[PDB]
Design a protein around this ligand. Structure first.
Ligand SMILES: O=P(O)(O)OC[C@@H](O)[C@@H](O)[C@H](O)CO
Ligand SMILES: O=P(O)(O)OC[C@@H](O)[C@@H](O)[C@H](O)CO
Lengths: 281, 264, 270, 280
């Protein structure tokens, strides 16, 4: 069981109290990001949950060219700077090109490898070389025993602060399932890397003929309870005050007024299961 | 809908979980009495409602000479002695329509095998026998499609139906449990109790605690479990029962007192 | 060899010209059955394709107890007897309960194990013991290398005349895919049983009409037979079926492809 | 629609199939020339239109320790020698936006890798470079969503897009080919040419492996099925001794079997391209 140091007082580990990697899908404006982060900060401080603010500066992989992509790298890094200065919390964002790794690492405290891109050697190596902890989204196409090779790429250039994020596996066409057995397989084939659960993207599904993802936000509690009960290092979550109006993955986003309600149940379950042993062997 | 199984045993999705626990196949009277005894002691100590499980026949094994159990006549005699001795209700699976009535005289719950869940005459003969029914969800069936089998049971007068998750086909020779399916099963069938068969879900590519925790945390009516004192010689090793069940009860008591977020 | 003889002039084999196991979903009336069988016979004769007429006497797995189930066993065997007498064609039907196997075997030339029921020991043994060739529908949930256990069960009670029928594999919820690599797996792991492709029930898939694409792909692999259901107006049918007027069009493409691949060699790729 | 690739090579779903055939990865000039030479001899003899394929880089090997190929600069020089020596058009894959333009100066078709087909700036870069594009369908993408990749290419002025089947995720560590996908790809994209990558479609793997498995012994089963549907092309990799290939050896056709495979493909293709749809 390895523990990954993110910032003062924030360390992720499979035996430790869970860390919330929480925020929004996509950066739209400064004031909206500050307001939503402000709400996450209030709730996580109230409940004593360690917190890392999440947002994407770009959606580089939208299905349609007409779908919204975000403010982009230059404006996104400025919004993150203001989040950090305003709230004093660390931030997490994803990186889509090798040349983005260094500039992003000047501001972000964790760099994320997107799910479709986790096998791309030069991107992973560039992210790892940037010197921050790395969150690897497990591809929809990848068995949980194969993530070890992604971790070895990071380790090869000297970065041993790697976390592994579950976000669902392809189940026929246009649907995901979460294999709850995958968490242990990920941890035990990688020397105990912290395992995180993206309950938001795991809820994705879609219409065969659709222009954008569908999703299953009404069931977020079902999935979040089940995952946190396994015993894991972190929970990855997106929210929006009105999910029907979100610009990306609205169908899977938690309504922001339900945040305290969800997190109080996560803490209660995490506090309970983190004290329970393995069965006697 | 809560389903009354016997005095002091009612399964329901908002109620404390019921353990449907026992062994894979009936082999002898004395060994069945001994294992059921261990299940009774642990569940009584922990305070978990209990229904004893065993099959009288394995009707779907890979060779005609492979061991099938004591069979119907002998199995029912064993079940009669389990009930008389421990005062416990019992659940067993029915493989042929004509077994329904005889099984129903002794068993308190009749189970529909997963492969057979769509066979009209078997389901109807089971439903008509007048005891609560447990329907194993086929590996091949989506969780919004169980409603038809429940309606078949209702069409011959049986509204005491429970639904059991045992995994979904995931490529060749492998099963995954979609934890989103529990709510689907309950909501599309008017709120039938949902049960999670942790043992047969693990017919897949050590792992039982992880999966049992995950399922119980969703908030469900029951857990379905097989054990053996020495599984080698997917059954739980019998000495781990108390350790497993105390984790199950603590998680279950917690989630059953926390509310739904009605997320729109 | 591992070729299965069904009746005079009709043998199924992975290296032989393909056999059509062709007919209808369910027996509803004598005259409708004779009319459709009549058409299959006329087309298959014209094209020179060996033919076995298919029908179920009961649909045992409909979604309501009040849903129409067909004429039933007694009336069904009566209908098959008149089909055999009128056309001199062998017949295949599926058997759902152990006790049906013997009386069905008096009349039918091939007995079929339903897909959902292929692991049920007493049903399969009763079917195998009745002494006719057996067609095993591969269950949606079963891998192509596991069918061998069903075939062994049949051999353990004296039946070495077993054929294996692809009908799709589970692919997420409410959808089937046909894995074209599984035909060879089925054949090779069972000592060379004839493999058959059920194009009709394989098309119980999503369609966000495609029978031709799929039949061409399957027959091109090089297999023992095609399983097909048809109806004059499928939408007004009782319980996926090909429009009957397209039968000759479909089968002429199937014959031309089959004749071609059956005279080109397997490559031994190490 | 028909996609003109070079003089005497046009791909289309009603046309005689085009072979996009070659090797998995460029290792050296002489081996590339020798293998390309055998493909050119065999296709010319049989009368099959031909585009030579190879990767200059494998940018997505599972292991950091696995072989990647000669790389962009040396790869482009090999391709220039292959073109001058045989007069064959070539196809290669592109992994970063900035590679598209230099690649297009030499390659005659540019390929989008399966895992990267949703990456907007990559697809747009590739499209803008002015050559026909081959899009590998992701293992995670349904056949009716390829239309969105085609629209990205269209949005920047490139309507010469072909769509390549290479299998779909089937549980863990396995692929299946849905033969009903070809039509769905063609009919939702205004009739783009559909290609079938028989080689990568055969991939499977060991859960604890370091590299891909594969099922080359079944390449004929699969290739027959797919060509019989009625498609625009076949995508194929070979090696003289597949066990020693440095990438995807488990799925590679033994090179001495090339003429035998291809003669069957031509026979089935010529037959099916003469047969109509069923009467409505
Ligand atoms: O454009 P659609 O189909 O909604 O796809 C959404 C994705 O871009 C989004 O989930 C993204 O992968 C977050 O990383
Ligand atoms: O490195 P392994 O796991 O063999 O994976 C091989 C892939 O890189 C290869 O298929 C590539 O996608 C195109 O050849």
């Amino acid at each position: 069981s390895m523990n990954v140091a993110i910032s003062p007082g924030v360390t992720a580990g499979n035996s430790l109290p869970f860390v919330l990697f929480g925020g929004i899908n996509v950066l739209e404006s400064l004031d909206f990001t500050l307001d939503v982060c402000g709400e996450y900060v209030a709730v996580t401080r109230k409940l004593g949950i360690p917190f890392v603010f999440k947002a994407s500066f770009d959606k580089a992989n939208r299905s349609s060219i007409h779908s919204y992509r975000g403010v982009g790298l230059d404006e996104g890094l400025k919004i993150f700077a203001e989040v950090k200065a305003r709230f004093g919390v660390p931030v997490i964002t994803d990186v889509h090109e090798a040349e983005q790794a260094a500039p992003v690492a000047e501001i972000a405290d964790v760099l994320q490898v997107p799910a479709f891109l986790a096998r791309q050697t030069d991107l992973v190596v560039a992210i790892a070389k940037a010197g921050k902890p790395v969150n690897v989204k497990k591809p929809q196409f990848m068995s949980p025993t194969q993530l070890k090779h992604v971790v070895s790429k990071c380790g090869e250039v000297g970065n041993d602060r790697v976390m592994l994020c579950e976000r669902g596996s392809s189940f026929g066409y246009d649907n995901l399932v979460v294999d709850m057995l995958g968490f242990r397989q990920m941890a035990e084939t990688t020397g105990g890397c912290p395992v995180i659960f993206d309950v938001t993207h795991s809820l994705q599904c879609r219409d065969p003929l659709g222009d954008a993802s569908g999703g299953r936000r009404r069931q977020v509690l079902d999935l979040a309870r089940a995952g946190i009960a396994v015993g894991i290092a972190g929970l990855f979550l997106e929210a929006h005050p009105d999910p029907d109006r979100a610009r990306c993955d609205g169908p899977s986003a938690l309504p922001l007024h339900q945040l305290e309600g969800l997190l109080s149940q996560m803490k209660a379950i995490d506090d309970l299961v983190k004290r329970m042993p393995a069965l006697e062997i």
